[model samples]
Target: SVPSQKTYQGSYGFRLGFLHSGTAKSVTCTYSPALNKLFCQLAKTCPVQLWVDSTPPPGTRVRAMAIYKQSQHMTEVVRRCPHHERCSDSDGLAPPQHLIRVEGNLRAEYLDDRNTFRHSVVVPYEPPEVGSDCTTIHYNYMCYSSCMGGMNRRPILTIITLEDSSGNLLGRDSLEVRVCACPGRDRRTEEENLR
Candidate 1:
């Protein structure tokens, strides 16, 4: 006699159920491209679930296997020193200052407005360590008056891109660095001159 078999249709495709001795087996039928695409889109919205077992079967039993694409995102940009200023003589010459430092973080999700990624590193600041020696005092009445006593503000836009191990760009984020500056030293001369 022929083996007993049954066939049924489902959302994805059709399936053939059969009984071999006492064990039952089922095989899924082929599906259309549109149905396959729909299943793929549905899978993308769901999170990966992992199943575990306390005990395993006897000799050389296979456990489980999973394949997934890694997700990535840009979190935040931390500015260590966001602002700097230095007063200059009438000639518009000022002493050099320390370099500013900025760092960024990447993660599986974009951080909130004020949140930073848990795994962030400080970007190294590399600047010339030496200072110049100059003793000449110059005065430019027009230049000093036009350039002093005001705060200069500017926007520093930083673009951060997130990529996977395969070098494919996953996402991008931008951080705005609003830098403000004012005169660092007093404009008064060493010797007070009577007006």
Candidate 2:
């Protein structure tokens, strides 16, 4: 299930273009420096010693780095209320909390060479266990469908945030595991310039 068996150089490497779900009204995103910072994705329940790289702000005191499954933040199912109703419409479509893998209070080893901080992050994945032809270990079936990722392309976003002592975010990042249990998807993902 996409385990980090060992260091595969760039076999699990990826680029740094992040798309934060638009919280409405405004849409913004964070891009890596021209040179970019590379990282990898980990799946399964085993305590694999995988690493995630981050670039905190120029003058920021980092508290603790926590990792969360981006599905909670990336998924949104709007259960529209009736045109003439007093309901808040909060009970329409429930969030898929089952997909959220929270790694709170995760610790990392800092490399001072270029202000780079790498975390010994351990993430996990879950799949139908039968759709090897359509789904992989990393890409599983979605709890709900949306237009952004089509019907089957469920992207697993690994959200990295730099927080202060108060647990407030100093910086935000959005990295994604691009895939799902879909057929006839594009080959563009394999063409990414990970190096």
Candidate 3:
């Protein structure tokens, strides 16, 4: 036996999937509002076909679920450090000359997937092209620095929600995460004045 048959987060708590293509190994990308297709995590990153889309979105038969909170967007100066210019309200490159960090919650292989039919126990949960590998700093919403230089930006705040079956209230997503390597973007506006 033991083939596993307990999907839908045990019966409608949270858990669904999408974002697929090939290679089956991902670089851990995050962002929501269901991310809405494409930007699939740049270069070789996509996988989470975990199960929640057996077809039902046109007059509905009630069978879907996707309401994950992956850390649900945090602020208050990002709780002070962990990747916010070294906190203390950072102003001019604070914190011993700068340093940031992020640890991989990696591999369930995923990000941005919400079908949300709300109320149905039968659920679960891409890749391709390259977009400069994948970089989002420490997953910005405010704290946005570090475009290149041994990189460090910690935090993985990815929020998600979806609703249907006439209980409608869908649409709400903010996301983040990036550990190391594959970084660069306008080269940080030419090193932003090079203090």
Best by lDDT: 3
Write down the TM-score of every candidate: 0.18, 0.27, 0.25
Candidate 3: tens digits of C-alpha lDDT, residues 37-127 = 2122322243322223233243221222222222232221122224443435423222222222111222111211244212112111111
Overlapping backbone residue pairs in candidate 2 total 0
Candidate 2, residue 70: CA error in Å?
Answer: 14
TM-score of 3: 0.25
For residues 81-107, what per-residue lDDT tens digits would candidate 1 score against the true structure? Answer: 222224221112211121121112111
Backbone N/Cα/C clashes per model: 0, 0, 9
Task: Please give the lDDT score for candidate 3.
Answer: 0.27
Q: Tell me the spans in candidate 1 whose CA falls farther than 4 Å from its real position.
A: 1-153, 181-195
Error of 3 at 74 (Å): 0.8
Tell me the whole-model lDDT of each prediction, alpha carbons only: 0.19, 0.26, 0.27
Lowest summed lDDT over 10 consecutive residues: which window, candidate 1?
35-44
Candidate 2 lDDT tens digits, 1-195: 111112122322211232222222221212223222212222112111222233333333222122223335333322111321232322233122222233332232222112322222222222113633111111121222222333233333333333444444444444333222221122122324544
Candidate 2 regions with alpha-carbon error over 4 angstroms: 1-96, 102-151, 154-156, 179-189, 192-195
Lowest-sum lDDT 10-residue window in model 3: 119-128
Worst 10 residues of 2 by lDDT: 133-142
Model 1, residue pairs in steric clash: none
Candidate ordering by lDDT (highest first) = 3, 2, 1
Candidate with more favorable, higher TM-score: 2 or 3: 2
Best by TM-score: 2
